Scaffold this active site. Sequence first.
Site, PDB file in Angstrom:
ATOM      1  CG  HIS C  41      -0.332   0.278   2.576  1.00 28.04           C
ATOM      2  ND1 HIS C  41      -0.054  -0.750   3.690  1.00 28.04           N
ATOM      3  CD2 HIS C  41       0.275   1.057   3.134  1.00 28.04           C
ATOM      4  CE1 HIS C  41       0.579  -0.219   4.233  1.00 28.04           C
ATOM      5  NE2 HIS C  41       0.729   1.126   4.341  1.00 28.04           N
ATOM      6  CG  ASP C  90      -0.560  -4.441   1.719  1.00 26.94           C
ATOM      7  OD1 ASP C  90       0.398  -3.766   1.431  1.00 26.94           O
ATOM      8  OD2 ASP C  90      -1.325  -3.547   1.880  1.00 26.94           O
ATOM      9  CB  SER C 186       4.247   1.680   6.346  1.00 24.91           C
ATOM     10  OG  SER C 186       3.870   2.242   5.899  1.00 24.91           O
ATOM     11  N   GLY C 187       5.471  -2.254   6.709  1.00 21.30           N
ATOM     12  CA  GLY C 187       5.857  -3.256   6.798  1.00 21.30           C
ATOM     13  C   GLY C 187       6.343  -3.732   8.106  1.00 21.30           C
TER      14      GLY C 187
END
Lengths: 347, 271, 237, 47
Positions: C41, C90, C186-187
């Site tokens: 994303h 994702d 994120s990640g």
Amino acid sequence: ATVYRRIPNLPDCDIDNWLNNVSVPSPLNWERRIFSNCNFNLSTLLRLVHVDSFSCNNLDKSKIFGSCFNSITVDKFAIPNRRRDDLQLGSSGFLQSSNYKIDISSSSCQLYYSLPLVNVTINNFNPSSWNRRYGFGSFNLSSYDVVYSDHCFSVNSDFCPCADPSVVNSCAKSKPPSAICPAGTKYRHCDLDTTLYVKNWCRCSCLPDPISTYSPNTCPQKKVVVGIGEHCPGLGINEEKCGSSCFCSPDAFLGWSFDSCISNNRCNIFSNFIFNGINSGTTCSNDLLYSNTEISTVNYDLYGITGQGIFKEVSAAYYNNWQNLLYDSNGNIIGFKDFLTNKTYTI
Amino acid sequence: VIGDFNCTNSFINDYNKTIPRISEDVVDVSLGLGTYYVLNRVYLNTTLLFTGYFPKSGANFRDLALKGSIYLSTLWYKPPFLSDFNNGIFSKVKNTKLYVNNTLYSEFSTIVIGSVFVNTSYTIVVQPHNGILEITACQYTMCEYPHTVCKSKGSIRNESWHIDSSEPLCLFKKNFTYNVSADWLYFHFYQERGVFYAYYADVGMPTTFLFSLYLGTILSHYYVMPLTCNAISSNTDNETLEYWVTPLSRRQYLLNFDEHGVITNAVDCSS
Amino acid sequence: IVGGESALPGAWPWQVSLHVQNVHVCGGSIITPEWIVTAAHCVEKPLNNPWHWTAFAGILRQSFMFYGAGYQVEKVISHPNYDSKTKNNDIALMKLQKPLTFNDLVKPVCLPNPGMMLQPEQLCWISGWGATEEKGKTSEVLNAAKVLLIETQRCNSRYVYDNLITPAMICAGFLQGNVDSCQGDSGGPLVTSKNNIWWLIGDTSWGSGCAKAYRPGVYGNVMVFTDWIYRQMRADG
Amino acid sequence: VRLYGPNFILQVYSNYGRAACRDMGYKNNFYSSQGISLRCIACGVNL
Ligand SMILES: *[C@@H]1O[C@H](CO)[C@@H](O[C@@H]2O[C@H](CO)[C@@H](O[C@@H]3O[C@H](CO)[C@@H](O)[C@H](O[C@H]4O[C@H](CO)[C@@H](O)[C@H](O)[C@@H]4O)[C@@H]3O)[C@H](O)[C@H]2NC(C)=O)[C@H](O)[C@H]1NC(C)=O
Ligand SMILES: *[C@@H]1O[C@H](CO)[C@@H](O[C@@H]2O[C@H](CO)[C@@H](O[C@@H]3O[C@H](CO)[C@@H](O)[C@H](O)[C@@H]3O)[C@H](O)[C@H]2NC(C)=O)[C@H](O)[C@H]1NC(C)=O
Ligand SMILES: *[C@@H]1O[C@H](CO)[C@@H](O[C@@H]2O[C@H](CO)[C@@H](O[C@@H]3O[C@H](CO)[C@@H](O)[C@H](O)[C@@H]3O)[C@H](O)[C@H]2NC(C)=O)[C@H](O)[C@H]1NC(C)=O
Ligand SMILES: *[C@@H]1O[C@H](CO)[C@@H](O[C@@H]2O[C@H](CO)[C@@H](O)[C@H](O)[C@H]2NC(C)=O)[C@H](O)[C@H]1NC(C)=O
Ligand SMILES: *[C@@H]1O[C@H](CO)[C@@H](O[C@@H]2O[C@H](CO)[C@@H](O)[C@H](O)[C@H]2NC(C)=O)[C@H](O)[C@H]1NC(C)=O
Ligand SMILES: *[C@@H]1O[C@H](CO)[C@@H](O[C@@H]2O[C@H](CO)[C@@H](O)[C@H](O)[C@H]2NC(C)=O)[C@H](O)[C@H]1NC(C)=O
Ligand SMILES: *[C@@H]1O[C@H](CO)[C@@H](O[C@@H]2O[C@H](CO)[C@@H](O)[C@H](O)[C@H]2NC(C)=O)[C@H](O)[C@H]1NC(C)=O
Ligand SMILES: *[C@@H]1O[C@H](CO)[C@@H](O[C@@H]2O[C@H](CO)[C@@H](O)[C@H](O)[C@H]2NC(C)=O)[C@H](O)[C@H]1NC(C)=O
Ligand SMILES: CO[C@]1(C(=O)O)C[C@H](O)[C@@H](NC(C)=O)[C@H]([C@H](O)[C@H](O)COC(C)=O)O1
Ligand SMILES: *[C@@H]1O[C@H](CO)[C@@H](O)[C@H](O)[C@H]1NC(C)=O
Ligand SMILES: *[C@@H]1O[C@H](CO)[C@@H](O)[C@H](O)[C@H]1NC(C)=O
Ligand SMILES: *[C@@H]1O[C@H](CO)[C@@H](O)[C@H](O)[C@H]1NC(C)=O
Ligand SMILES: *[C@@H]1O[C@H](CO)[C@@H](O)[C@H](O)[C@H]1NC(C)=O
Ligand SMILES: *[C@@H]1O[C@H](CO)[C@@H](O)[C@H](O)[C@H]1NC(C)=O
């Protein structure tokens, strides 16, 4: 060979009249009465009550006979057939955790007795203040059934199982019912949030129920354990079924059960005696001084007069209501009247 | 000032014209008035020479009855109203009869006997309840300004003579009954060697033994608390409260008993 | 990371911060010295042209370089069956143009093999450069916390997410709150301890705030995408 | 082709060393092997 008669200065305690009362409270009530400044007889008390078991803790039954105490408090309640094992001295049962806690560091005696099922009624009354504030009535159970609690909760004075309806209007998923809460109490905390694409998703607290909730730290209803001499502050309320004034449905109260108390066509009741102060006070026992109480027609202690002599059954009518001894002009005693049998003797 | 508790200060002033009165009658023990029967002894056809506590023949009484409407005076709780209990007193009480819807009620003042009137010592209270005498000896927490309230016609104040959340420690507690249609009542109170004795009578005759209690201490003061009534004055009905008291002394008397053990006449050895 | 503590310069050499326009945006993890695992994303259509990407390693406090001392990403591979509406599948991969020779404070983590037999309420760890309490700024130092894994049946309850957790996603965190990851993480490596070796099992995808009740964290289940990573690495050569 | 269990066990549906991991994913940097085991790359480091 010892005749000991004396008029008491204090009345009788009459514990059997309160124990054999037609109204028996539930474990949630456990009415209490304090006895002080009176005389009691343990043998008569155990005889006039149908005794099943009598044991004491931190005190022996031998020293009860003839000892004086300052005050005696008695607590009574009916025993459910399911939770009879929870009344032992030290146990993490529903009764000792939610209804009545038995103190282990005091001189106490436990009594199990029965009462005939005729003309006896059980009073199931919730002593909770905040529960009846929002519309709690009665349990509406059949006869010979007692109510006990397994989970008890406590809330602050600023509490209302109700949300502000102005905020709840903008909700689409899990919209809780709302109403008008009385002044001085905060409303139920609900917030609007979006997860990924749901705009109107309103999240509230105390879900699903206060008994089994996922976040106990965010729900105002908190679990508590009753202490020494305390009732349950209140039962849990399902906030999803509450709500004019905020009136919760009678089916929205959780944390209570019931069971019968009929065993051999009789009702079982628990009693706890707590003695406050030993070797003091004026609440004494009459077991030692009323052992024989029989004059055979001998050392005598008659109303403070000590001596020895004989007795005979004569008819005397010169004794008034306040007169019990007969004296001559020389100062000796030649007769007395017995206030227990209404018989007069000559010495 | 009897106790040490601040219970009520609604209407408290300093009155100046309350003086006890002296009766016109004297003590006459010829027919037996002023004497008491023995504790529980019966004497038949005897003449007894008894050394006890009896009042002086020819002494005058004094009225210690207090009746108030709204205000209470601080001087009513000080001497000479707070007298000393040296040996004993002989009280002549008047039974005030009130009518409410053609029925009779009995009301008269109550007396309190004690030492310091604190919850660390015992005090004796004798209070009537419409024909029932209540006598209790407890560790009462007496107030500073005690009073009694009329229950027949009510009053503007509330009854407040002791303040105790719990039941204090009592040594004696018993109820007695008297005649409601009586006109005068007589009592005998005295003490010796730590033992307290009490007598009572509802007719004109020697007194009747009530009880005895061992305290171990010496009682020094006695007080007759005022009574707050709605209508007892020369405004609604001509009724008054009277409580005559005379001191007691250790004297020697001669008592004559008849065939049935009733006292016929008595002679004081000192004219 | 809320409720955690700043991680000392120990041995957790599987966190790589990706910088575009010289600012930190998303994290990542390394499995081999030619590929970096991260969320998809953050690599959407506006984030194309992998030439505008750089990676850092062995850096706890986020101030050690500017337009230099970094590794340029050659190509970025994303999952083809990715939906931006429900946020399913994702996972994105990035290839570095440098061999990335191993040294101190540099060591990857192995992919989870099929048949781990993980416990329901297993213990895991999270790490990243996110906010501190709520909607804050980027954490300068590297912090971490300890989280627990919750089952999908309880996560799909009507009072938590109402059947929004696909089999390709897993829920981890605490239902009481006070421990979660905020925007910026994120990640992110979600690792666990088993057989004296750490295994990467999660990948931060989305969530409803952080440190809030009834709102746990959603992580991508790399167990399903393990075969796709191997297929892409085989087709790359 | 595949790999099962926490320990490394070579399975397909039920020696070479580097050549084994070669056409199975990581085409280089073979670490070691064992007996019962294919350890392609090194992992599990903590302070
Ligand atoms: C046995 O007798 C003793 C002696 O009388 C008695 O101790 C007294 O207790 C009372 C009640 O607690 C005390 O009265 C208080 O005195 C303080 C000053 O010391 C006042 O500030 C208090 O006022 C507060 O409470 C009032 C309500 O009562 C409020 O209206 C007011 O606004 C204040 O908040 C209160 O008047 C008294 O001081 C003591 N006496 C001594 C000498 O300490 C004791 O309680 C008795 N025991 C029993 C069991 O009755
Ligand atoms: C004995 O006890 C009574 C209470 O039973 C005490 O009376 C109280 O006195 C205080 C101080 O004067 C009063 O407070 C005042 O109240 C008025 C309004 O009523 C206010 O305007 C003043 O600013 C002040 O707050 C209190 O109300 C009063 N209570 C009652 C019921 O009378 C009395 O002081 C005590 N006396 C002592 C010390 O012995
Ligand atoms: C001697 O006789 C008097 C008068 O008959 C008895 O007094 C009465 O005592 C009872 C028992 O305490 C009182 O009942 C209680 O009243 C209070 C209110 O004051 C109430 O809260 C209680 O629940 C209870 O009902 C009664 O009111 C009282 N009557 C009067 C006029 O005072 C006294 O008990 C008798 N003494 C003995 C030793 O029996
Ligand atoms: C038997 O139980 C009844 C019901 O609890 C008692 O009646 C209450 O007695 C208390 C004590 O003063 C009063 O305060 C209540 O108002 C009474 N309630 C009712 C409904 O009458 C009764 O006193 C008990 N009997 C005995 C001998 O203790
Ligand atoms: C007071 O308690 C004493 C102590 O038990 C009672 O004495 C017993 O009375 C029963 C009958 O009521 C006899 O069978 C026992 O033999 C008595 N005990 C002894 C040692 O003799 C006494 O009866 C009680 N008083 C009242 C009025 O019940
Ligand atoms: C001894 O005699 C007295 C008086 O005759 C009895 O007291 C009476 O008892 C009855 C029955 O309860 C009452 O109705 C009377 O009011 C009582 N009179 C008085 C003056 O108290 C007493 O009960 C007798 N004792 C025994 C054991 O029979
Ligand atoms: C209480 O005192 C009254 C007043 O003397 C008594 O009533 C008298 O009773 C006798 C006997 O029946 C009558 O001859 C009198 O005429 C009554 N007098 C009045 C004024 O009624 C009454 O008997 C006394 N109470 C008791 C229980 O004896
Ligand atoms: C109490 O007695 C006095 C004295 O007899 C009464 O006073 C008289 O009352 C009548 C009626 O009002 C008047 O006509 C007289 O002038 C009053 N006499 C005096 C000297 O004042 C008084 O009324 C009686 N009390 C009641 C309540 O009637
Ligand atoms: C008839 O007056 C009463 C009454 O109204 O019943 C009777 C009585 O005259 C009097 N009471 C006492 C003890 O002196 C009393 C006082 O003389 C006045 O009431 C004044 O009392 C105070 C305290 O000011 O008044
Ligand atoms: C109540 O039941 C008991 C038990 O048989 C009995 O002794 C008592 O007389 C009964 N009372 C009434 C009023 O029926
Ligand atoms: C009590 O329960 C019975 C049985 O369900 C019902 O018929 C009755 O209406 C109920 N009464 C109340 C007041 O709830
Ligand atoms: C009360 O009487 C005394 C003595 O006559 C006097 O000194 C005092 O002023 C009087 N008090 C009042 C309030 O009249
Ligand atoms: C007296 O009787 C009347 C008429 O029956 C009545 O109205 C009044 O209340 C009664 N008074 C009292 C004190 O009972
Ligand atoms: C008596 O008590 C009542 C009830 O609280 C009260 O209203 C009244 O003021 C009291 N009277 C006095 C004189 O204190």
